[PDB]
Design a protein around this ligand. Structure first.
Ligand code: NI
Length: 206
């Protein structure tokens, strides 16, 4: 059926989403899972901030809708079309990138289709497993150890790092993979278009 989480709301706002869920028989949870069908984002009059629920929502090719879907569907005393409320973008990667949509329609051709990714080093605003979960949803295959990369010529390995979380340009010294920054993933995921690694490469010492 339907299952929702919310992002960037206030309790009153949440109250409304509840009221909405209550009336329409929609399941409403604190945590996002595979089952979650909808992510309701606080937006301007339809840009939201980039939250984790925001990313995993796109990663799952789910319904990433602005809070206005809710308040209107209450105002109209009926449930409107997820289609005319969607999140057209966000502050970070442009107010007009249509990420979520792209994501819904692209469930065959996933941006990280046929990749091997190792989220290496420590991470901040994201549990690594969540970052990892993210990339699995985008058709990447997760590696956990630099040295566990597959030898098949067909596959492409990538080391993802978040430089902030350290006290690491020697990666290229420990394997033969490109090193990029978490922004690569994030940026790729919002836009749902696998980015030119170029911008994101980290210097690897010989
Ligand atoms: Ni190649």
């Amino acid at each position: 059926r339907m299952s929702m989480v919310v992002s960037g709301l206030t309790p009153e706002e949440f109250m409304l989403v509840y009221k909405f869920a209550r009336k329409h028989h929609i399941t409403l949870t604190n945590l996002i899972t595979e089952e979650t069908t909808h992510v309701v984002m606080k937006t301007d009059a339809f840009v939201c901030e980039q939250t984790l629920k925001y990313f995993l929502g796109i990663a799952g090719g789910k319904w990433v809708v602005s809070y206005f879907w809710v308040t209107q569907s209450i105002k109209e005393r009926k449930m409107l079309n997820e289609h005319d409320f969607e999140v057209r973008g966000d502050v970070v990667n442009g107010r007009n990138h249509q990420g979520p949509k792209r994501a819904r329609e692209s469930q065959d051709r996933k941006i990280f289709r046929g990749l091997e990714i190792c989220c290496y080093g420590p991470f901040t605003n994201m549990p690594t497993d969540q970052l990892e979960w993210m990339v699995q949803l985008c058709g990447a295959s997760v590696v956990k150890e630099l040295s566990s990369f597959t030898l098949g010529t067909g596959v492409h390995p990538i080391v993802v790092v978040q430089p902030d979380a350290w006290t690491f340009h020697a990666i290229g010294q420990m394997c033969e993979a490109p090193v990029v920054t978490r922004e690569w993933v994030l940026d790729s995921v919002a836009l749902y278009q696998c980015q030119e690694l170029d911008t994101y490469l980290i210097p690897q010492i010989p």
